[PDB]
Amino acid sequence: DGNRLMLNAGRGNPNFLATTPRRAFFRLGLFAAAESELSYSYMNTVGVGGLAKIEGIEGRFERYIAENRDQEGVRFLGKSLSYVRDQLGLDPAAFLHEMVDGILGCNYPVPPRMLNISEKIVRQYIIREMGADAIPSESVNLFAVEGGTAAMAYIFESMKVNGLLKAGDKVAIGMPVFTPYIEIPELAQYALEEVAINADPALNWQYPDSELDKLKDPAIKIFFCVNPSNPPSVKMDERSLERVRKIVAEHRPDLMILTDDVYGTFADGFQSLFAICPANTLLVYSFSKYFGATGWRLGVVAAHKENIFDLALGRLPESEKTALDDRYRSLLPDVRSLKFLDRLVADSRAVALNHTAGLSTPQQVQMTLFSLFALMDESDQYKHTLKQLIRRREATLYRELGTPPQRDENAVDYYTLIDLQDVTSKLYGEAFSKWAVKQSSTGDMLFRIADETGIVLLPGRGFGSDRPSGRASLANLNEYEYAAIGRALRQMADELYAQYTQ
Amino acid sequence: DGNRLMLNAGRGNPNFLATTPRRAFFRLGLFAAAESELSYSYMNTVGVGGLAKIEGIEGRFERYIAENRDQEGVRFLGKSLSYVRDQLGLDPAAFLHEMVDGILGCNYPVPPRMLNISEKIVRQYIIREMGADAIPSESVNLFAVEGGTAAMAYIFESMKVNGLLKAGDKVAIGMPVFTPYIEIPELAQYALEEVAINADPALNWQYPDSELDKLKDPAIKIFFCVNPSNPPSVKMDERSLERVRKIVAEHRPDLMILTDDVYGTFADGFQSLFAICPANTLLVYSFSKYFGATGWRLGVVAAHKENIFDLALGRLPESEKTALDDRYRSLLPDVRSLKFLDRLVADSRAVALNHTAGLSTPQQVQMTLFSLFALMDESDQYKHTLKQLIRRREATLYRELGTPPQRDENAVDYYTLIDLQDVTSKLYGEAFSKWAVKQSSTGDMLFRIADETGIVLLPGRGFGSDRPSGRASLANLNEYEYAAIGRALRQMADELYAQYTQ
Ligand SMILES: *Cc1c(COP(=O)(O)O)cnc(C)c1O
Ligand SMILES: *Cc1c(COP(=O)(O)O)cnc(C)c1O
Numbered sequence A, B: 001d002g003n004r005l006m007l008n009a010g011r012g013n014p015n016f017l018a019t020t021p022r023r024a025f026f027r028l029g030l031f032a033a034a035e036s037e038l039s040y041s042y043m044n045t046v047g048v049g050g051l052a053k054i055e056g057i058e059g060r061f062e063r064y065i066a067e068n069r070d071q072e073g074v075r076f077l078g079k080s081l082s083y084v085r086d087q088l089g090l091d092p093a094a095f096l097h098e099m100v101d102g103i104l105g106c107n108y109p110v111p112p113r114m115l116n117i118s119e120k121i122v123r124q125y126i127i128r129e130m131g132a133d134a135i136p137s138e139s140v141n142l143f144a145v146e147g148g149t150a151a152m153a154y155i156f157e158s159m160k161v162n163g164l165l166k167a168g169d170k171v172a173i174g175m176p177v178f179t180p181y182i183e184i185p186e187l188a189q190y191a192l193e194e195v196a197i198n199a200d201p202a203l204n205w206q207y208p209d210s211e212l213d214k215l216k217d218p219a220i221k222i223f224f225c226v227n228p229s230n231p232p233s234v235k236m237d238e239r240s241l242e243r244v245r246k247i248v249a250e251h252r253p254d255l256m257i258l259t260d261d262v263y264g265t266f267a268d269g270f271q272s273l274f275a276i277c278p279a280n281t282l283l284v285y286s287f288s289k290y291f292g293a294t295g296w297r298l299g300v301v302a303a304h305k306e307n308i309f310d311l312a313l314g315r316l317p318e319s320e321k322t323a324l325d326d327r328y329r330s331l332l333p334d335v336r337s338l339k340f341l342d343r344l345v346a347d348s349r350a351v352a353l354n355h356t357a358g359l360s361t362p363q364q365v366q367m368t369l370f371s372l373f374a375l376m377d378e379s380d381q382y383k384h385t386l387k388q389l390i391r392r393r394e395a396t397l398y399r400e401l402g403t404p405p406q407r408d409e410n411a412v413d414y415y416t417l418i419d420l421q422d423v424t425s426k427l428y429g430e431a432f433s434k435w436a437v438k439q440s441s442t443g444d445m446l447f448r449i450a451d452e453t454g455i456v457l458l459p460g461r462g463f464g465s466d467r468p469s470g471r472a473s474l475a476n477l478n479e480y481e482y483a484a485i486g487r488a489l490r491q492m493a494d495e496l497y498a499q500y501t502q
């Protein structure tokens, strides 16, 4: 399943996971279960509870924390309350009841877009990790969704439905990008045309100015990028972000930006395009990778309250405004005041079902607890732990290839590129590396590792020339498995060197 | 004492008792004791507490419930709060403080008639078990008293004092009734005249229309009945209740009804005369039999807020109104607005002591807890348990007499009639049963059982012919004792059959 996921979906699945916010969730659940039972009125039954009451919830919660000081999840829950009440200044009783009611999953999400306090908490996390601090928190709204996967499906459908993207429109795509994102515009369902914004291996996988300038073409309605990138696993540098900023400000104030920033926390000092061009950007952030929460399906779509999506909607042709008046008629009297972010919500479940739309309340609670976990960790201990783990696995991989590729300030390294030439160069000089590349390819490299270790790697391209290389995730295997990849690739190189000399 | 009670008082005393509401009471007491100690200010003393404080009582109570989840009485107390707050919509803090203050018995009952929340709770129980659901709860008021025993004493005295019953007035009494109720009107203290409303054995102890029509006599001021009956142990059927209803509506809107419905819960789908004619009826309900609480002395008098007792009081001759103005002068400025139900309270302790009158607060608390116990038991598990117990004891009794009398929909069976003829008929045919009755009587039947088993039974009459029969309570003995009664009565029948044949 780990090997099959990389081939099919270009992921990625970590073998680590955040335990403390998970324990806090299950412990909160036991508290909420007791809260439900406090509202059950009848004798001689079993298995039926009532709704949790907001009245006196703080005092009951405080007792629960005091009696269970020995439980890690409970201590976390205790500090979470302080963080929300004391640092965020939010209503403590309202926070607790939203969490209790939320984890019970006994009420339809209200509002459907996101639960009130969860939105306020999660956006603090999002703003911080995206480097978007210069934007007032109150100007950022979130739509809680079933991972980045759901976000992308919802966004393209709403773009189509609301006439923001039309058949024949050009979508610029920062490349190399993983397979799934190439196909969605290529669907006849959308019939969009791709323009490649190509990263340069000579610039260490940054986008050249010349490539970024392609965005000046007014036929290009949207810039779509994974940042930090996947496969290449680098973050857009200061120059690149500035270039986009100037292009938007100077030439294309109408350019929509769709940015997928799931790997952000794995970079040093990450800054999102959302931070740089908030009015022009829809941010997709997934909790999957950082918290080891792929199965939880936790994501948000973020939008600035003043954005070009709502501006474009006000500039639509009359026939389209009339069609949308009909579409959203049941939702509100004035459809023209219905914002794009809330249209995403309505479009996600056929409009008529808007009031039972949204991410499940226990999922939002869990998302909120992951968010708190990271926010309360001021010295970034969890982040550093994961980074040290990733570096250890890297050292182990390149042990006999030695050693790892040199990493700059823009490095992410969730993924690593094992380049045959660079490896054979490090081992046996420049002359040998030129020859070794002409002998074997990516196929012979990936098939050998697979046969020796049972691990299949991603080809390392490209698009390029088929420079013989493979990509491994530093997130999904254990040390001896990275050591076995290195050993198999070292024997392959050693046998090439014995076929070099003689 | 069990045998002596049936002979003297026509009871009845169960050998079962409701344990859960009793455990809840004692557990509540320990909580209240701690509440009292929280208000004690001084050092180096022992055995002195203060008054329980309403402030923060919910939170303290909730902690008490959480720490003692393993205690049956405490779990019941926890669910009681939910029932009162959530299902009845009453003030939870006020409920708790009434219960805490109540069980401490540290304040005179206020108001004297009944404690406020206890009245609201207990009437829900009363209305449900009496089948009086069609009457709005707010239109039913209760006077908490020391069992049905105190109720009857109080009611007759107030009837006399307030001129509603006068010497020479006729009291109709549904018969057979147990001894105590025959004597109270016969007292020179009241000098009332009895009219027998006779139940018909041919109608399975229902009152014939012809007997019920006796109520048309305007000299009959009150209909007094035990329903379900005692001794006969049947409930008034649909026809009988309708007959009384029409008689009251058509001929006697002035007829007072006094109904004693202690056995109600032992019938299937019981409906009280209070439900049928609320404006005309004073309901006496005792908790003694159903909860096995004879020693607790727990009863209520129930009255509709719009009733013929207050109507009659407004129609009294001027000399009587003047006398009552003097009597109740200290109570309120306008004595003519003092309702009959509150007159019962004032008459119970000599008027001048009205403000220290009423049932003890711990008794009312216990009554409230019995009421909750039954209200919260939606599937009527306790009721069914008692009924199955009663049926088992019946099967055991008639095992060798076999088998029990056929029971119709109006059957109660707390008591059972052991008819010699019917028993000997079931065993040895109709011819033998006619002869066996002419040989032995009720005396020879009751004296034989007494000598063989040590149990004395009630004669089974009548008034009738002395058809040789005995009444046993199915509530007061254990299985082997019922088996010994059956065996003694079977040998008596077998020796009669050996004196038949030869
Ligand atoms: C793993 C990954 C995601 C996260 O997907 P979810 O559906 O949120 O689990 C998003 N984008 C890219 C490019 C990824 O590699
Ligand atoms: C047992 C019984 C009662 C109950 O008497 P308390 O004084 O309430 O215990 C009332 N009426 C009748 C006919 C009974 O047999």
Ligand SMILES: [Cl-]
Pocket: A023, A024, A027, A071, A072, A073, A074
């Ligand atoms: Cl835990």
Ligand SMILES: [Cl-]
Pocket: B023, B024, B027, B071, B072, B073, B074
């Ligand atoms: Cl107990």
